[PDB]
Amino acid sequence: PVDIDGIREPVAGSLLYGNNIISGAVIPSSASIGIHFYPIWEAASLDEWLYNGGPYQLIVDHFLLGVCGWIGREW
Amino acid sequence: MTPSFSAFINSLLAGLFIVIIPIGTALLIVSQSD
Amino acid sequence: TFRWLAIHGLAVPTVFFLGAITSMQFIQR
Amino acid sequence: METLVYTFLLIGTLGVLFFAVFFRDPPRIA
Amino acid sequence: METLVYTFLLIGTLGVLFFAVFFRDPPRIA
Amino acid sequence: NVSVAAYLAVLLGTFVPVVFLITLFIQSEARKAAES
Amino acid sequence: NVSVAAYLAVLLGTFVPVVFLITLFIQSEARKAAES
Amino acid sequence: GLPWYRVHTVVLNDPGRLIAVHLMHTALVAGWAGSMALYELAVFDPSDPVLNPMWRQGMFVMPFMARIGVTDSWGGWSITGESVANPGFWSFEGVALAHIGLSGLLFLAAVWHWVYWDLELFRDPRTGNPALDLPKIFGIHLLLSGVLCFGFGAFHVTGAWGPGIWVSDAYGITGKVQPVAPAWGPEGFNPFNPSGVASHHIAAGILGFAAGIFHIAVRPPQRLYRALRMGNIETVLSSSIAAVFWSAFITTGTMWYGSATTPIELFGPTRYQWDSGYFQQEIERRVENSLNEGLSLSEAWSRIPDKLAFYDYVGNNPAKGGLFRAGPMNKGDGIAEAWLGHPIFQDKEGRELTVRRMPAFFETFPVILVDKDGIIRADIPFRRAESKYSIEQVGVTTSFYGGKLNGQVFTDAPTVKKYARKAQLGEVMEFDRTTLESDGVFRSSPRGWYTFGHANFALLFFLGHLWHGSRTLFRDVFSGIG
Amino acid sequence: YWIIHSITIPALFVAGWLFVSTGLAYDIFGTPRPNEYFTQERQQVPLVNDRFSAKQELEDLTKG
Amino acid sequence: SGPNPNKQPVELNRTSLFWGLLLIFVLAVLFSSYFFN
Amino acid sequence: SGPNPNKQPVELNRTSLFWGLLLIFVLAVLFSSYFFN
Amino acid sequence: RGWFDLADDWLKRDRFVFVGWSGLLLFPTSYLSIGGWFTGTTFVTSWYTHGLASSYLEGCNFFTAAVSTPANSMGHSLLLLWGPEAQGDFTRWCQIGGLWAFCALHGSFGLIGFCLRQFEIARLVGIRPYNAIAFSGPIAIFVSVFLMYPLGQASWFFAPSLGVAAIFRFLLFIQGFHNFTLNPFHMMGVAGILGAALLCAIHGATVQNTIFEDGDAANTFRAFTPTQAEETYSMVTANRFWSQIFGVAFSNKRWLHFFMLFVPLAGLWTSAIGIVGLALNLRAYDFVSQELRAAEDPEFETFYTKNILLNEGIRSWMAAQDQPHENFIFPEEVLPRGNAL
Amino acid sequence: EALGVDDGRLLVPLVLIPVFVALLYGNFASTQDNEDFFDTYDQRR
Amino acid sequence: ALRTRLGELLRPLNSEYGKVAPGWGTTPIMGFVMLLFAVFLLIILQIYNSSLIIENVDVDWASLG
Amino acid sequence: MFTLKIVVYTTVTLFVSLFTFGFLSNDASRNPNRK
Ligand code: CLA
Ligand code: CLA
Ligand code: CLA
Ligand SMILES: C=Cc1c(C)c2cc3nc(c4c5[nH]c(cc6nc(cc1[nH]2)C(C)=C6CC)c(C)c5C(=O)[C@@H]4C(=O)OC)[C@@H](CCC(=O)OC/C=C(\C)CCC[C@H](C)CCC[C@H](C)CCCC(C)C)[C@@H]3C
Ligand SMILES: CC1=CCCC(C)(C)[C@H]1/C=C/C(C)=C/C=C/C(C)=C/C=C/C=C(C)/C=C/C=C(C)/C=C/C1=C(C)CCCC1(C)C
Ligand SMILES: CC1=CCCC(C)(C)[C@H]1/C=C/C(C)=C/C=C/C(C)=C/C=C/C=C(C)/C=C/C=C(C)/C=C/C1=C(C)CCCC1(C)C
Known part of the structure; x- marks a missing residue:
């Protein structure tokens, strides 16, 4: 679960933590992160990175690059 | 005969004489004329 | 023509409503 | 246990997409 | 509820027997 | 007080082999009808 | 959280239509192979 | 070859195999009826007919069996709760067997027709091609319909040579199967008069008999034969689908709004009875009348039947369930055991306060207690919210009249708040949720499930009417234009 | 074309203007004027309560 | 009985x-969450 | 690749x-009682 | 010939506007529905039904003007002008919301007339009637939303009012009281609509970008003429492009156009099924397992629970003004707030 | 902070890999006819 | 085509396929009966809808007793 | 953390360099109308 509001109150969005396909989601990054660049190597631990919603930033950045590449590849 | 039944019958008559009869008259009058 | 009728059935209310709305524009509201 | 059903359904859908892409009926001019 | 499953299995077996008897491949001399 | 997956096992182990046999028989009959 | 009925509904609802489509496709391919 | 969605069109021009597949569908339907009745019997509990009725146990076909006379059972019980000495072959167990027996016969007939697809009857003497005189078949079938219709009304709904139908009071406290005489005046037209059913079926049966004679004797005009494509079976299919979704819409409306053919003891209360307080006004009415007699409040509320109080409960509202909240209403809020009695709330000053009842639209409703003039005196605050009119701060107290808690006064805030939450649901009832592991989320009555299913079926059959009518009116131009 | 329209289209517009200017619109469609939304007494929202006495109710509400 | 002329391949x-x-x-996938409720 | 000569009909x-x-x-029928236990 | 024949000949004449037999039902009903909507949004108020001002005469603009639904005291009454509610009085009929019933009924009959018009013109031109089957989608939408939903509810009051802001209010009201986004049939409808828009855009771009060079001009719209026996764009090039870009591509034009027809129609019919389910409050509002998990675990939170809290907020903070007939009075303490959770 | 390079070792990939590939490209570049074309694009390849 | 006793018994009922009456036949009678049926449906609908209140026709549950 | 960062930097630099030098390799000539 990810502390999205940055208030030590984690929100679960994973299938293993009690979500179904409809409720399941990749929770956005922590509000304490803001729009700071948050890769894996910029977190103290992997648990910290998962707790602050780092995978959301990873997926968003790689997806947004992939769709730009898809536009270019269609051309 | 409640006022409701009287409204119903007059509604049937008005629909006949304001909608059905005028429109039908026109179609027969113009269809036959052309 | 039938077109005449349909055009006037559209237009005679259209101009009436335009006049009504223009009058509504000058209400003290 | 329902998580196993959800994962199975998602993986089955992805496999159906894979087989539809790489094992489609090959288009030919007739 | 398991009684429903037992009854369903028994009637399915009886129906399979019925179809095997009355819808078999008709023997012929070759 | 019966089990739960128990129903799943019974129903699927009945259906999976039945639909396989039915599919095989229908395929064979289709070949026979197409060739004839 | 629902009973094996919810599991039976999802698994059978998925399989009964899947095996029907697979049987139909295999029958069609069998006819195509037999006639060619 | 044929696509998957046109396969059954092989029996479009084969009358024998069309009869075979229709026989198969009738066999499947009858087998479903018998199996559903047997399953419902295996699950039905006749222990508590007043507080655990059939509509609280998810019974679907049992209400339709009980509507037109089947009330006894081979187990020595009846739905009215009377103990039947000699049930009789026509019992829900017997009726369930009869539907299954019919299904077996239909399957054998369908196979015989399928094997003998080629019968002389089916062939046109003139051309030697399989054909069906529908205008005539319609007439023969219409005439058959009229006879069966007239018959149900004259011998069954009336009781001349039949059991009669289910007739109850205005508040579903005393209802049973009984003969109903026909009402030939205008009073036979309101949906809430059972006599109208008998008069309708008799008159419509006679008219249908006459119409069948006509449609047998008289051939259709050439203009109608060419316009409606009466030589094509698909126009019959389209018209039949149109009439069936028409009837489906009508039955959906009668079930949802209520009728003499949808008794509340068989299908449960309607939502509009809760919206207008149909049972609450009667309960208050009875209490006032008892008080006018001099009877004290406790005696007045003790004269109220449990069934009537259970009707004035929002958990029995059909508009409180969910689409995927499956199972009976007992699975939803537990099985009702006994009526706890009417609660009365009084503040420190002594004003009588009423908990505003929950409208069916709200999944959650604020708990507010209001005085005679409608001022809010107390409320349960939204969780962890600072308040000024809390039940603890205003000191509301609850005194029960009638039921198990009759004569008991509760001053403690936790108990008062619990009863106040329960009071917003209408009459306070005690439920057990261990026997069925109930989740506490309201389910829907069989009335609501029937309404939902048949409304969706009617819409999809309107789509089918459009498609099949387009198909039969555009047969020449299908498969491409020129 | 332009001859007849030069004397009826103008009138049609003016008629609409007058309909509103005179206040007939309010009288015909029952739309409350800006000074009669809340009567001194009825300072609350007026709502019909019964369907079969709706005409009388509205006559009572709009009498002021 | 006999050969049925209306037989068509599928x-x-x-x-x-x-x-x-x-x-x-x-x-x-869509209805599994609702069936599991 | 190509047409395989080992393909046989079933x-x-x-x-x-x-x-x-x-x-x-x-x-x-035999194993249902044991699976239900 | 016979009167019918001559009337049929006249109604079928090739004029600028086709009339036909279906026109006798379509033109008056549709004209009256449109005119009644304009009259309601221009003059008729909603003060005695909703406690709202909804006319240009009252000061509303295009967005906030609406033909509001009848009062909740009317129930599911046909609200005939001669009916017992109005008793022939036009002013009282407009004040009780009878103009909404007028518009809704004459508009439903206008939709029926337009569907019959599509059928009749298709029968004339000699083409398959795949129109009036596509239009069955919008017909089902209108029937489920404006007719079946209020009929399943308490009265016509809970139907959508014929206005922009009224439609937005209906959206938010249904979301608050039903959680309609969570409804799977609504999800299928959203998928159908978005996929239909995707198909329209992608098919237009694919055709425009695979045209044959049939002209010497840089602007290629002149290179096409309707009397062409040759295709104006390369299906093979488009199939190759989409098969090596997306992994799958259309090879049959007929199937492609039938699919572009089928997706929005299926989406609309699924959404209609969902709205019919909503009509009886038979809604996929909540997941029981998630509610039970949240009840026994205060630290368990998902976006579904946040949506449930948001729907509770819409219901409590709108009930008072959206349903003035109920006379809802909620103190500030009972109103839910994120601060107090 | 210049490329997110907080450790000098990060500059060994950012330089060696672009150079090495460029070296592969240099062979393509030496094989091309590199005289000027008066055209929208060079078709010589 | 198999001949059966029941087939021969019911054969005249399925003998006049395509037989039609000349012109319009009984079409005005059908239209008149359809108009009467439409009026009857309107009457019963407005009675259920409570837009039509005949005396001694209380469309209500309380009319049951 | 440094090793993951150096691996990611290596991979990204490799792919970006491949992209850049691939579009520098006379990409316009790679069309079916080129002679
Ligand atoms: C001997 C025949 C027979 C008898 C006595 C019964 C008796 C019964 N059946 Mg069974 N059934 C039968 C045959 C029979 N069935 C067959 C052949 C089928 C297969 C199609 C079924 C399928 C079936 C199901 C699926 C169910 C029943 C149910 C029932 C019970 C309630 C009946 C009811 O409410 O019907 C109500 C029927 C109607 C309202 C239909 C009315 C007819 C319409 C209005 C005709 C409209 C068109 C018409 C031609 C127009 C006439 C024009 C006019 C001018 C004359 C009852 C015990 C129910 C039950 O309780 O479960 C066991 C149930 O759910 N039956
Ligand atoms: C007109 C049809 C109809 C109606 C109104 C009812 C009504 C009822 N039935 Mg019955 N039933 C029916 C047909 C019907 N049944 C048939 C045909 C069967 C045989 C399969 C059954 C078998 C049956 C059983 C075994 C039981 C009931 C029960 C019930 C009750 C509660 C049902 C419930 O909660 O629904 C819940 C419904 C849902 C959760 C989903 C409904 C379908 C939705 C709309 C979606 C389906 C389409 C969707 C695309 C599917 C996706 C598939 C995907 C996996 C590929 C209620 C009285 C129960 C009861 O209390 O009786 C004692 C019970 O135990 N019914
Ligand atoms: C009395 C009702 C009735 C009857 C006899 C028919 C008969 C026919 N229809 Mg029509 N149809 C109906 C109702 C009916 N339909 C309705 C209500 C709809 C609206 C959805 C349609 C929509 C429709 C279309 C769009 C088409 C037909 C077609 C056909 C023909 C072939 C059907 C086929 O092979 O399906 C084969 C079906 C399958 C192999 C599997 C379908 C399974 C479905 C999707 C779900 C399972 C349903 C379940 C098992 C039982 C449903 C319960 C019941 C109460 C509804 C046949 C003449 C087709 C045709 O030939 O016309 C050119 C065609 O294109 N029909
Ligand atoms: C909100 C979206 C929306 C609108 C406004 C709309 C509107 C229209 N589509 C039509 C056609 C179609 N719609 C089609 C597919 C679709 N249409 C869709 C969505 C829409 N379609 C979708 C999602 C699909 C995919 C299935 C097809 C396939 C057709 C056609 O064949 C037809 C056409 O030719 O279009 C090119 C026309 C129908 C004319 C008619 O009934 O006769 C006259 C109008 C009548 C009878 C309506 C008046 C009564 C209405 C229902 C109530 C009154 C409404 C007020 C006047 C306005 C209220 C405004 C507020 C709500 C804001 C009309 C221009
Ligand atoms: C053989 C014969 C010989 C002579 C005499 C005999 C011995 C007595 C006899 C034997 C007879 C007996 C043993 C035969 C009796 C047999 C059986 C029990 C008949 C039952 C059929 C069940 C019906 C068709 C259900 C369909 C379920 C629905 C459509 C699925 C619906 C679902 C779809 C997906 C839509 C969504 C959800 C719903 C709506 C739930
Ligand atoms: C500037 C601007 C910006 C964007 C572009 C733009 C949109 C083009 C433009 C807008 C321009 C504008 C503002 C355009 C506006 C145009 C308008 C307002 C047209 C109004 C037409 C009114 C009609 C048809 C009413 C007819 C009444 C009838 C049928 C009565 C019915 C009756 C009722 C009440 C019911 C009882 C029965 C009877 C008695 C029959």
Whole structure:
């Protein structure tokens, strides 16, 4: 679960933590992160990175690059 | 005969004489004329 | 023509409503 | 246990997409 | 509820027997 | 007080082999009808 | 959280239509192979 | 070859195999009826007919069996709760067997027709091609319909040579199967008069008999034969689908709004009875009348039947369930055991306060207690919210009249708040949720499930009417234009 | 074309203007004027309560 | 009885098979959460 | 790649289908009591 | 010939506007529905039904003007002008919301007339009637939303009012009281609509970008003429492009156009099924397992629970003004707030 | 902070890899006819 | 085509396929009966809808007793 | 953390360099109308 509001109150969005396909989601990054660049190597631990919603930033950045590449590849 | 039944019958008559009869008259009058 | 009728059935209310709305524009509201 | 059903359904859908892409009926001019 | 499953299995077996008897491949001399 | 997956096992182990046999028989009959 | 009925509904609802489509496709391919 | 969605069109021009597949569908339907009745019997509990009725146990076909006379059972019980000495072959167990027996016969007939697809009857003497005189078949079938219709009304709904139908009071406290005489005046037209059913079926049966004679004797005009494509079976299919979704819409409306053919003891209360307080006004009415007699409040509320109080409960509202909240209403809020009695709330000053009842639209409703003039005196605050009119701060107290808690006064805030939450649901009832592991989320009555299913079926059959009518009116131009 | 329209289209517009200017619109469609939304007494929202006495109710509400 | 002239072969192409499998799996994914409630 | 010369058609006659259906149903009847325990 | 024949000949004449037999139902009903909507949004108020001002005469603009639904005291009454509610009085009929019933009924009959018009013109031109089957989608939408939903509810009051802001209010009201986004049939409808828009855009771009060079001009719209026996764009090039870009591509034009027809129609019919389910409050509002998990675990939170809280907020903070007939009075303490959770 | 390079070792990939590939490209570049074309694009390849 | 006793018994009922009456036949009678049926449906609908209140026709549950 | 960062930097630099030098390799000539 990810502390999205940055208030030590984690929100679960994973299938293993009690979500179904409809409720399941990749929770956005922590509000304490803001729009700071948050890769894996910029977190103290992997648990910290998962707790602050780092995978959301990873997926968003790689997806947004992939769709730009898809536009270019269609051309 | 409640006022409701009287409204119903007059509604049937008005629909006949304001909608059905005028429109039908026109179609027969113009269809036959052309 | 039938077109005449349909055009006037559209237009005679259209101009009436335009006049009504223009009058509504000058209400003290 | 329902998580196993959800994962199975998602993986089955992805496999159906894979087989539809790489094992489609090959288009030919007739 | 398991009684429903037992009854369903028994009637399915009886129906399979019925179809095997009355819808078999008709023997012929070759 | 019966089990739960128990129903799943019974129903699927009945259906999976039945639909396989039915599919095989229908395929064979289709070949026979197409060739004839 | 629902009973094996919810599991039976999802698994059978998925399989009964899947095996029907697979049987139909295999029958069609069998006819195509037999006639060619 | 044929696509998957046109396969059954092989029996479009084969009358024998069309009869075979229709026989198969009738066999499947009858087998479903018998199996559903047997399953419902295996699950039905006749222990508590007043507080655990059939509509609280998810019974679907049992209400339709009980509507037109089947009330006894081979187990020595009846739905009215009377103990039947000699049930009789026509019992829900017997009726369930009869539907299954019919299904077996239909399957054998369908196979015989399928094997003998080629019968002389089916062939046109003139051309030697399989054909069906529908205008005539319609007439023969219409005439058959009229006879069966007239018959149900004259011998069954009336009781001349039949059991009669289910007739109850205005508040579903005393209802049973009984003969109903026909009402030939205008009073036979309101949906809430059972006599109208008998008069309708008799008159419509006679008219249908006459119409069948006509449609047998008289051939259709050439203009109608060419316009409606009466030589094509698909126009019959389209018209039949149109009439069936028409009837489906009508039955959906009668079930949802209520009728003499949808008794509340068989299908449960309607939502509009809760919206207008149909049972609450009667309960208050009875209490006032008892008080006018001099009877004290406790005696007045003790004269109220449990069934009537259970009707004035929002958990029995059909508009409180969910689409995927499956199972009976007992699975939803537990099985009702006994009526706890009417609660009365009084503040420190002594004003009588009423908990505003929950409208069916709200999944959650604020708990507010209001005085005679409608001022809010107390409320349960939204969780962890600072308040000024809390039940603890205003000191509301609850005194029960009638039921198990009759004569008991509760001053403690936790108990008062619990009863106040329960009071917003209408009459306070005690439920057990261990026997069925109930989740506490309201389910829907069989009335609501029937309404939902048949409304969706009617819409999809309107789509089918459009498609099949387009198909039969555009047969020449299908498969491409020129 | 332009001859007849030069004397009826103008009138049609003016008629609409007058309909509103005179206040007939309010009288015909029952739309409350800006000074009669809340009567001194009825300072609350007026709502019909019964369907079969709706005409009388509205006559009572709009009498002021 | 005898040979029935109305017998017709039934064909389902691969595209139709994949369309059907995708539809069934997607409907299962959608309605599984609601069936499990 | 290319057409493989080892491909052979599979046949299941009706007697074999009925034998298989009977075997599966009988095994289900036998083992249902033990699976339900 | 016979009167019918001559009337049929006249109604079928090739004029600028086709009339036909279906026109006798379509033109008056549709004209009256449109005119009644304009009259309601221009003059008729909603003060005695909703406690709202909804006319240009009252000061509303295009967005906030609406033909509001009848009062909740009317129930599911046909609200005939001669009916017992109005008793022939036009002013009282407009004040009780009878103009909404006028518009809704004459508009439903206008939709029926337009569907019959599509059928009749298709029968004339000699083409398959795949129109009036596509239009069955919008017909089902209108029937489920404006007719079946209020009929399943308490009265016509809970139907959508014929206005922009009224439609937005209906959206938010249904979301608050039903959680309609969570409804799977609504999800299928959203998928159908978005996929239809995707198909329209992608098919237009694909055709425009695979045209044959049939002209010497840089602007290629002149290179096409309707009397062409040759295709104006390369299906093979488009199939190759989409098969090596997306992994799958259309090879049959007929199937492609039938699919572009089928997706929005299926989406609309699924959404209609969902709205019919909503009509009886038979809604996929909540997941029981998630509610039970949240009840026994205060630290368990998902976006579904946040949506449930948001729907509770819409219901409590709108009930008072959206349903003035109920006379809802909620103190500030009972109103839910994120601060107090 | 210049490329997110907080450790000098990060500059060994950012330089060696672009150079090495460029070296592969230099062979393509030496094989091309590199005289000027008066055209929208060079078709010589 | 198999001949049966029941087939020969019911054969005249399925003998006049395509037989039609000349012109319009009984079409005005059908239209008149359809108009009467439409009026009857309107009457019963407005009675259920409570837009039509005949005396001694209380469309209500309380009319049951 | 440094090793993951150096691996990611290596991979990203490799792919970006491949992209850049691939579009520098006379990409316009790679069309079916080129002679
Ligand atoms: C001997 C025949 C027979 C008898 C006595 C019964 C008796 C019964 N059946 Mg069974 N059934 C039968 C045959 C029979 N069935 C067959 C053949 C089928 C297969 C199609 C079924 C399928 C079936 C199901 C699926 C169910 C029943 C149910 C029932 C019970 C309630 C009946 C009811 O409410 O009907 C109500 C029927 C109607 C309202 C239909 C009315 C007819 C319409 C209005 C005709 C409209 C068109 C018409 C031609 C127009 C006439 C024009 C006019 C001018 C004359 C009852 C015990 C129910 C039950 O309780 O479960 C066991 C149930 O759910 N039956
Ligand atoms: C007109 C049809 C109809 C109606 C109104 C009812 C009504 C009822 N039934 Mg019955 N039933 C029916 C047909 C019907 N049944 C048939 C045909 C069967 C045989 C399969 C059954 C078998 C049956 C059983 C075994 C039981 C009931 C029960 C019930 C009750 C509660 C049902 C419930 O909660 O629904 C819940 C419904 C849902 C959760 C889903 C409904 C379908 C939705 C709309 C979606 C389906 C489409 C979707 C695309 C599917 C996706 C598939 C995907 C996996 C590929 C209620 C009285 C129960 C009861 O209390 O009786 C004692 C019970 O135990 N019914
Ligand atoms: C009395 C009702 C009735 C009857 C006899 C028919 C008969 C026919 N229809 Mg029509 N149809 C109906 C109702 C009916 N339909 C309705 C209500 C709809 C609206 C959805 C349609 C929509 C429709 C279309 C769009 C088409 C037909 C077609 C056909 C023909 C072939 C059907 C086929 O092979 O399906 C084969 C079906 C399958 C192999 C599997 C379908 C399974 C479905 C999707 C779900 C399972 C349903 C379940 C098992 C039982 C439903 C319960 C019941 C109460 C509804 C046949 C003449 C087709 C045709 O030939 O016309 C050119 C065609 O294109 N029909
Ligand atoms: C909100 C979206 C929306 C609108 C406004 C709309 C509107 C229209 N589509 C039509 C056609 C179609 N719609 C089609 C597919 C679709 N249409 C869709 C969505 C829409 N379609 C969708 C999602 C699909 C995919 C299935 C097809 C296939 C057709 C056609 O064949 C037809 C056409 O030719 O279009 C090119 C026309 C129908 C004319 C008619 O009934 O006769 C006259 C109008 C009548 C009878 C309506 C008046 C009564 C209405 C229902 C109530 C009154 C409404 C007020 C006047 C306005 C209220 C405004 C507020 C709500 C804001 C009309 C221009
Ligand atoms: C053989 C014969 C010989 C002579 C006499 C005999 C011995 C007595 C006899 C044997 C007879 C007996 C043993 C035969 C009796 C047999 C059986 C029990 C008949 C039952 C059929 C069940 C019906 C068709 C259900 C369909 C379920 C619905 C459509 C699925 C619906 C679902 C779809 C997906 C839509 C969504 C959800 C719902 C709506 C739930
Ligand atoms: C500037 C601007 C910006 C964007 C572009 C733009 C949109 C083009 C433009 C807008 C321009 C504008 C503002 C355009 C506006 C145009 C308008 C307002 C047209 C109004 C037409 C009114 C009609 C048809 C009413 C007819 C009444 C009838 C049928 C009565 C019915 C009756 C009722 C009440 C019911 C009882 C029965 C009877 C008695 C029959």
